[PDB]
Design a protein around this ligand. Sequence first.
Ligand SMILES: [Ca+2]
Length: 257
Amino acid sequence: SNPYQRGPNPTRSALTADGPFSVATYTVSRLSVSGFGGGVIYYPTGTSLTFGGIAMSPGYTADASSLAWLGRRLASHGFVVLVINTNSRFDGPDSRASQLSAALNYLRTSSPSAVRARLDANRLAVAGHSMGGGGTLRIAEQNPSLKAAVPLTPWHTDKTFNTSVPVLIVGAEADTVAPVSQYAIPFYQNLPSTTPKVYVELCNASHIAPNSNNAAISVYTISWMKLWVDNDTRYRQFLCNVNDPALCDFRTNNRHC
Ligand SMILES: [Ca+2]
């Protein structure tokens, strides 16, 4: 049996709402940490188990609140999640990668005792929005110890990331900021053919789709994190044989099926 498996058997409906774990938060002040701008930790409560960790970056001009719904959503399905604020709201994608690295170090070492007590530091992942998704791609390339990476409507001027970390990219069909033809799709195509990878494109969605409750983002992000952070094969069903009415594209090399 899988020692990292958490929660009841999933249904698709259950992955579109907060999950079976209650969630608490801890606010990490900007002045209290080195290498990033603080943020908010979301973590499961009412449980004696340990969970994988996820660090998430917002995009240009944005703060951690722009991903609060998703940090809480992931935590409620069984993850310790640190959504960062950046040193400057104007930091670029590679800077955001460096800050995600600093945030993962903080999460493992200097976060509250209660957070470390429910964190399995051996199982970590990253996600992020826009330039924060660019940072997710870069840290995945720099840090093959990561279990998974989920760039959401990502933006970066570099298009090729030589990473072995399994990547699921969410593109937005109606994105006029990081259009999928110039950003998300090239990122997917240029990843190594040997790295497990998925691209999903949300029909009719804008660049700010990741900043509020979104059923498809919830399903695909939870499932990819579950499959790779927890080795939880019960989530393969949502990532294989896909026929999703909300998607206008789906690409994969089918290394996870
Ligand atoms: Ca700081």
